[PDB]
């Protein structure tokens, strides 16, 4: 299941209908940018588990045999 | 504020742990765990019409092509979903009813998806944030 | 054809660098308050820099040079080593 989540995060633009605004936004890699931008200011409000999960997923994105 | 937030109604936890082992818990079919409300029904029947009104209004909003385009209807939608959230968290809904409401809300958001500088209404975001608590409760 | 995202390791690292994961990890180290968050940031930076990617090293150097706040970034390592 974690591998499925990572694979979705590689290419999440496929889940949207073609030529729609969401899909053009996601096809440019803006999803990961927004995710890391939110994670940057996330640490203040004391969410250690959620930030840890985000970081672990971003790290596991750098694995082979995907 | 007059009726929903009043005694004896009070918050209920959706996950229980001190489950007495000697009790029945039989095969209990599939969707009948949320039952045996011999005392909750006496409060339930008077808000039954309110709950079905909420459900039919949300279905009507589903039928509308653009749910978040009218500014004056946004107030009614926001307070309706707030009332639904308060009703749910107080323990006024069943499992199948919660699934129907979840399907309705997901249909609203999917229609919004089909619709898809640009200063959006803050209360539209408030409405969108409201249903997240409902989703968390139904997951629990 | 196959429509496969081949995405070799070096280009994946450079891709994640473009959005600014380097800034993310350096800021998380900067304002870390828990041991686990700092440990995960270190592991993420190790996985990102693995293979000697010159672009990521250049990004780290550029941000550390342009940012006047890097003193605490170095202090976080210094006091950790001192405690060890």
Swiss-Prot record, chain A:
Leader sequence residues: none
Modification after translation: Polyubiquitinated. Polyubiquitination targets ITPR1 for proteasomal degradation. Approximately 40% of the ITPR1-associated ubiquitin is monoubiquitin, and polyubiquitins are both 'Lys-48'- and 'Lys-63'-linked.
Cellular localization per UniProt: Endoplasmic reticulum membrane; Cytoplasmic vesicle, Secretory vesicle membrane; Cytoplasm, Perinuclear region
Residue ranges of coiled coil: none
Subunit structure and binding partners: Homotetramer. Homodimer. Interacts with ERP44 in a pH-, redox state- and calcium-dependent manner which results in the inhibition the calcium channel activity. The strength of this interaction inversely correlates with calcium concentration. Part of cGMP kinase signaling complex at least composed of ACTA2/alpha-actin, CNN1/calponin H1, PLN/phospholamban, PRKG1 and ITPR1. Interacts with IRAG1. Interacts with CABP1 (via N-terminus). Interacts with TESPA1.
Role, per record: Inositol 1,4,5-trisphosphate-gated calcium channel that, upon inositol 1,4,5-trisphosphate binding, mediates calcium release from the endoplasmic reticulum (ER). Undergoes conformational changes upon ligand binding, suggesting structural flexibility that allows the channel to switch from a closed state, capable of interacting with its ligands such as 1,4,5-trisphosphate and calcium, to an open state, capable of transferring calcium ions across the ER membrane. Cytoplasmic calcium released from the ER triggers apoptosis by the activation of CAMK2 complex.
Domain notes: The ITPR1 structure has a large solenoid CY assembly built around the central helical bundle made of the C-terminal domains from four ITPR1 subunits. The solenoid scaffold includes domains responsible for binding of ligands and regulatory proteins and is connected via an allosteric nexus at the cytosolic-membrane interface to the transmembrane channel assembly. Six transmembrane helices from each subunit form the central ion-conduction pore.
Family per record: Belongs to the InsP3 receptor family.
Name recorded for this polypeptide: Inositol 1,4,5-trisphosphate-gated calcium channel ITPR1
Species: Rattus norvegicus (Rat)
This protein's encoding gene: Itpr1
From Swiss-Prot, chain C:
Gene: Itpr1
Compartment list: Endoplasmic reticulum membrane; Cytoplasmic vesicle, Secretory vesicle membrane; Cytoplasm, Perinuclear region
Record's function text: Inositol 1,4,5-trisphosphate-gated calcium channel that, upon inositol 1,4,5-trisphosphate binding, mediates calcium release from the endoplasmic reticulum (ER). Undergoes conformational changes upon ligand binding, suggesting structural flexibility that allows the channel to switch from a closed state, capable of interacting with its ligands such as 1,4,5-trisphosphate and calcium, to an open state, capable of transferring calcium ions across the ER membrane. Cytoplasmic calcium released from the ER triggers apoptosis by the activation of CAMK2 complex.
Stated name of the protein: Inositol 1,4,5-trisphosphate-gated calcium channel ITPR1
Domain notes per entry: The ITPR1 structure has a large solenoid CY assembly built around the central helical bundle made of the C-terminal domains from four ITPR1 subunits. The solenoid scaffold includes domains responsible for binding of ligands and regulatory proteins and is connected via an allosteric nexus at the cytosolic-membrane interface to the transmembrane channel assembly. Six transmembrane helices from each subunit form the central ion-conduction pore.
Organism: Rattus norvegicus (Rat)
Family that this chain belongs to: Belongs to the InsP3 receptor family.
Subunit structure: Homotetramer. Homodimer. Interacts with ERP44 in a pH-, redox state- and calcium-dependent manner which results in the inhibition the calcium channel activity. The strength of this interaction inversely correlates with calcium concentration. Part of cGMP kinase signaling complex at least composed of ACTA2/alpha-actin, CNN1/calponin H1, PLN/phospholamban, PRKG1 and ITPR1. Interacts with IRAG1. Interacts with CABP1 (via N-terminus). Interacts with TESPA1.
Classification lineage: Eukaryota, Metazoa, Chordata, Craniata, Vertebrata
Lineage top rank: taxon: Eukaryota
Post-translation changes: Polyubiquitinated. Polyubiquitination targets ITPR1 for proteasomal degradation. Approximately 40% of the ITPR1-associated ubiquitin is monoubiquitin, and polyubiquitins are both 'Lys-48'- and 'Lys-63'-linked.
